[PDB]
Amino acid sequence: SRIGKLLGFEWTDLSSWRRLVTLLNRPTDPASLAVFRFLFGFLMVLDIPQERGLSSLDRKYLDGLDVCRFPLLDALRPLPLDWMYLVYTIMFLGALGMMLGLCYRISCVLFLLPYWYVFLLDKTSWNNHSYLYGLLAFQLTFMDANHYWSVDGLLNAHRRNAHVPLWNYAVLRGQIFIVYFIAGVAALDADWVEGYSMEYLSRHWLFSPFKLLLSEELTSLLVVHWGGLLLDLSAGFLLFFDVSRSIGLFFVSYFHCMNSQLFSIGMFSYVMLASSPLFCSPEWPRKLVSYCPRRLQQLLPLKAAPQPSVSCVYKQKPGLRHQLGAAFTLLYLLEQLFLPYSHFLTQGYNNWTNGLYGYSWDMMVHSRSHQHVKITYRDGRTGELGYLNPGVFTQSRRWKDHADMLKQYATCLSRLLPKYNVTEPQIYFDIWVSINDRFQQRIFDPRVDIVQAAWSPFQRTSWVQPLLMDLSPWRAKLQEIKSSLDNHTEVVFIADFPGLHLENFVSEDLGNTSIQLLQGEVTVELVAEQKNQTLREGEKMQLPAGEYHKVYTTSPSPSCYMYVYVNTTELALEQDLAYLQELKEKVENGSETGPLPPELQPLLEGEVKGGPEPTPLVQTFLRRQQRLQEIERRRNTPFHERFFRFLLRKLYVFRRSFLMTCISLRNLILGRPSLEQLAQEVTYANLRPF
Amino acid sequence: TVFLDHENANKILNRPKRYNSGKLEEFVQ
Ligand SMILES: *[C@@H]1O[C@H](CO)[C@@H](O[C@@H]2O[C@H](CO)[C@@H](O[C@@H]3O[C@H](CO)[C@@H](O)[C@H](O)[C@@H]3O)[C@H](O)[C@H]2NC(C)=O)[C@H](O)[C@H]1NC(C)=O
Ligand SMILES: *[C@@H]1O[C@H](CO)[C@@H](O[C@@H]2O[C@H](CO)[C@@H](O[C@@H]3O[C@H](CO)[C@@H](O)[C@H](O)[C@@H]3O)[C@H](O)[C@H]2NC(C)=O)[C@H](O)[C@H]1NC(C)=O
Ligand SMILES: CC(C)=CCC/C(C)=C/CC/C(C)=C/CC/C(C)=C/Cc1c(C)c(O)c2ccccc2c1O
Ligand SMILES: *[C@@H]1O[C@H](CO)[C@@H](O[C@@H]2O[C@H](CO)[C@@H](O)[C@H](O)[C@H]2NC(C)=O)[C@H](O)[C@H]1NC(C)=O
Ligand SMILES: CC(C)CCC[C@@H](C)[C@H]1CC[C@H]2[C@@H]3CC=C4C[C@@H](O)CC[C@]4(C)[C@H]3CC[C@]12C
């Protein structure tokens, strides 16, 4: 029938459970499943020393170090450094076995268990492509991916060129479609459609051909934003149908190739590229081998027809294995569709977006900008106030946007502080964030002690400041102001809630600073003079430099205002430097016949030898000139040199990871050697290549 | 510098080192 030739099955196959099980276990060619299996394992091997964190294990998990960590479960803790190296060694071996097909099921488990343990250890390392790797490994554990091109085929005669169940391809194809489609739906947000996210991505040289027929603004809006949205929503349908597969393959290949150079996402683009041929005929690799010379065929996988396999149902009564496989493909695909939209039961992980980042397929939709962070503590006994350096005991900055991470950070601080003579501290946070070029605003209540604050996984957090969505239309006006400013002027846009105030200390270098009111009403107090002045819409007031001032939001609705300032110290210094350069040019061109000043002598000589120490202005000028020369030298570098340096950097990363693992494995098995011996070995492992 | 002082803590108009916007999807060294 027409439907049978289009979808690959018929309505009769869904009539009963037995028919459904029979259809899902239909024998299929394993050539395509094997090629993807090899490619996935090869890329996993490459990724382990680069992004999984093998080359920085000693720095991250240093023994006897004070660090605040963010595990999903508070009871999950890492192992000592030597045992952490063993975990990565087992993960590496499992990936190698998967790529080769040697002891397929054991190798799959060896990769899977260590991978998820490391993933759950750090919530700050979660992203969409790392989440996908764990999903792909989980699926392949139950698949017969070692039936065509693997070592297991040589070890066992029954696993050499054998059929595989159809649900092996259905689950993999369904997973890839979900990644495309859910991403396209998430890209339906107003910010994406209007072109606010990644509004500067069209300046890359890779977009040169488009600019020959479009403007910069038009190219960004149509190509980058609407083009990406269209591909996500139609990539799955294009690949599935064979009348449009050729067009889809070219479009997705171009889409992924560009992304590999526009962003730094590790192996994401290469994994997606490899998954594309999974929609083609399951025997495409075998057909390609058929077009090879007879001599070359002796070094390639078999080309004959696959042999029957017990995993499939042949036109018999299905057994337990077939029924379980049918159940898995239905339940697993159902769970994948639901989870990205489950952010209504776990209400404790929503602050401004939905849930933790990593399992919603929302790539590059929201961009954040942080302006300032302040951490305050008050001693429980003494009662004195103090301030901490933001992110003092952290290895990442993601704690600023999540209430679950902030609660962990505050608990960690209260445990460490007593060792610095602080007893029973109370900690407050003041973080200013802006999302997609909006007004800068607070994200948490600055009057709440987070140590004693209440947090639950299933309850909405009480001390999270709502996002001011009503002020979004101001973005057009904000850009207009920022485009009319002078080359030496800067502006900051702030919105504050009623009943709150902002305390600001203006640096001495920021001469000529002023504040103007855009909406609402505020009161500005000069702390030193104890003077209060009220402001009205469109009113601007000058502020002193090197002093304190406070802004009170007295309106019943949030107020908006902007800061305009100029760095006077830098401006004067640059003018002096420019004047010196003009004088030097006058000397060089033959003018200024008069004797050069003693300070100008170092400029001509370029080396301070046998003379008085040069003034800071001369040193600054020399440093700037040297920096410009280095920049010019870096630009004038042939492509061959650039590629060679790139390969050398990779070689050092791979070599260091191997040597550090050997040292740790030696300690575990034989025993720790003398300190002098250990110091020498670490020095050897830190040597650069070549 | 674990401990700060009043002037540095409240200095809002300071050169932000993390001026560039982040995506949360890009790998960081
Ligand atoms: C402190 O810095 C601000 C911002 O740079 C200075 O404001 C600038 O003031 C000058 C006049 O003194 C403005 O120039 C005049 O404004 C019109 C407006 O249309 C403009 O077309 C011309 O340039 C005109 O001469 C200038 O525009 C304005 N800055 C900006 C970016 O608009 C201010 O003067 C500084 N204060 C001190 C004491 O130096
Ligand atoms: C206004 O301009 C002055 C320069 O005229 C700025 O001072 C400079 O600030 C930068 C950081 O923004 C300093 O760079 C960093 O500081 C450390 C510690 O001093 C130094 O080791 C390195 O240079 C480091 O990169 C810089 O040293 C400092 N001074 C100079 C002479 O450049 C000032 O920050 C500006 N003020 C504002 C609020 O924009
Ligand atoms: C061929 C012609 C005439 C026009 C083509 C017109 C076309 C398709 C331009 C495309 C270039 C362009 C503007 C690419 C950035 C768009 C963005 C931000 C996609 C978001 C995104 C990103 C960043 C990823 O890393 C992904 C990785 C794996 C899977 C999905 C991913 C994904 O969805
Ligand atoms: C200037 O006016 C502000 C208006 O807010 C005063 O700030 C208030 O001070 C009183 C105590 O005098 C507090 O009870 C309020 O809570 C403060 N306002 C807030 C935080 O909304 C400020 O004291 C005045 N300054 C001077 C020097 O008189
Ligand atoms: C002590 C621990 C870390 C070691 C054992 C790892 C366990 C917990 C791993 C192995 C397989 C994993 C599961 C594999 C696949 C999925 C589907 C995904 O959509 C949600 C997570 C979930 C449900 C994983 C949860 C964690 C998991 C059960």
What gap in Å lies between CA B21 and CA A438, rounded to an integer?
A: 13
Six token digits for residue A32? 């395509």
Task: For chain B, state the CA radius of gyration.
Answer: 14
Distance CA A307, CA A303 (A): 12
Residue A521 CB less than 6 A away from ligand 4: no
Domains of chain A, residue spans? 22-62+69-337, 367-467, 474-566, 570-590+598-635, 639-685
Q: Do B25 and A263 touch (CB under 8 A)?
A: yes
Report d(CA A685, CA A689) in Å as an integer: 10
Q: Would you say B24 and A127 are in contact if contact means Cβ atoms under 8 Å apart? A: yes
**How far is it, in rounded angstroms, from Cα A408 to Cα A405?**
5
Q: Is the CB of A280 under 6 A from ligand 5?
A: no
3-state helix, strand, coil in chain A (%, to 5): 50, 10, 35
**Contact call for residues A19 and A315 (beta carbons, < 8 A):** no
Residue located via tokens 């998954």: A275
Task: Give the phi and the psi of residue A304 in degrees, each rounded to 5.
Answer: -75, 180
Task: Give yes or no for residue A357 CB within 6 A of ligand 4.
Answer: no
Nearest to B12 among A366, A372, A387 (CB): A372
- Residue of chain A with shortest Cα separation from B3: A388
Is the CB of A117 within 6 Å of ligand 5?
yes
Nearest residue on chain B to A510, alpha-carbon basis: B13
CB of A263 sitting under 6 A from ligand 3:
yes
Distance A24 CA to ligand 2 centre (A): 66
Contact call for A389 and B4, based on CB within 8 A:
yes
Cα gap A83→A85, rounded to integer Å: 5
Rounded Cα–Cα distance for residues A190 and A4 (Å): 40
Cβ separation of A367 and B22 shorter than 8 Å?
A: yes
DSSP category for residue A222: I
Cβ neighbours of residue A243 closer than 8 Å, sequence gap 6 or more: none
Binding site residue list of B for Ca(2+): 19-20, 25-26
Enclosing H/E stretch for A389: none
d(CA A10, CA A22): 12
Measured from the Cβ of residue A314, the count of other Cβ atoms closer than 10 Å reads 12
* Gaps after residue numbers in chain B (C–N over 2.5 angstroms): none
Distance of alpha carbon A198 from alpha carbon A214, whole angstroms: 18
Residue A263 is given by DSSP the state S
Contact, A599 vs A615, CB < 8 A?
Answer: yes
Main-chain phi, psi angles of A670, to 5 degrees: -80, -60
Helix (H, G, I), strand (E, B) or coil at A541: strand
Is some CB atom of chain A closer than 8 A to the CB atom of B1?
A: yes
DSSP string spanning A83-113? HHHHHHHHHHHHHHHHHHTTTHHHHHHHHHH
Which residue of A363, A365, A367 sits with most ligand 3 atoms within 8 Å of its CB, as the best mutation to test the pocket? A363
Contacts across the A-B interface (CB distance below 8 Å)? 81
Backbone angles phi, psi at A305, to 5 degrees: -75, 145
Q: How far is CA A614 from CA A48, A581, A617, A619, in A?
A: 50, 16, 8, 7
Q: Which atom of ligand 4 is nearest the CA belonging to A553?
A: 21
As a whole number of angstroms, the distance between CA A668 and CA A655 comes to 20
Under 8 Å between Cβ of A63 and A661: no
- Coil, strand or helix at A435: strand
CA of B13 to the centre of ligand 2 (A): 13
A 10 A CB-CB count for A528 gives 10
Indicate which atom in ligand 2 lies nearest the CA of residue B11.
38
Q: What is the 3-state secondary structure (H, E, C) of A329-380?
A: HHHHHHHHHHHHHCCCCCHHHCCCCCCCCCCCCCCCCCCEEEEEEEEEEECC
Burial class of residue A183 (count of CB atoms within 10 Å of its CB; 0-12, 13-18, 19+): buried
What letter represents residue A519's amino acid? Q
Q: Please enumerate in sequence order all residues whose Cβ is within 8 A of that of A639, keeping only pairs 6 or more positions apart, or say none.
A: none
Per-residue three-class SS string for A8-22: CCCHHHHCCHHHHHH
Which of A366, A370, A513 has its CB closest to that of B18? A370
Q: Using an 8 Å CB-CB cutoff, list chain A residues near B27.
A: 51, 127, 264-266
Among B8, B14, B12, which Cα is nearest to A567's? B14
Residue indicated by tokens 């009403």: A521
Q: Tell me the CB-side half-sphere exposure of residue A342, using CA atoms within 13 A.
A: 12
Which ligand is the nearest neighbour of the Cα of A575?
2
Q: Which of A531, A542, A535, A543 is nearest to A560 (CA)?
A: A535
CB half-sphere exposure, A552, CA atoms < 13 A: 11
In angstroms, rounded to a whole number, what is the distance separating the alpha carbons of residues A148 and A55?
34
Residues of A with CB under 8 A from a CB of B: 51, 127-129, 263-266, 357, 363-364, 366-372, 374, 376, 386-389, 392, 397-398, 420, 432, 492, 502-507, 510, 513, 548, 563, 565
Residue A386: beta bridge partners? A377
Resolution (angstroms) stands at 2.6
Of A367, A376, A392, the CB nearest to B2: A392
Give the DSSP H or E segment for A533. Answer: strand A531-535
Q: What does the block give as tokens for A325?
A: 């496989």
Half-sphere exposure of A64 (CA within 13 A, CB side): 0
CATH superfamily assigned to domain A474-566: Jelly Rolls (2.60.120.10)
Interface test with B, best of A269, A369, A413 (most B CBs within 10 A): A369
Place of tokens 């002098």: A676
**Residue A489 Cα: closest atom of ligand 1:** 5
Neighbours of A41 (CB within 10 A): 23
Cα A213 to ligand 1 centroid, rounded to whole Å = 37
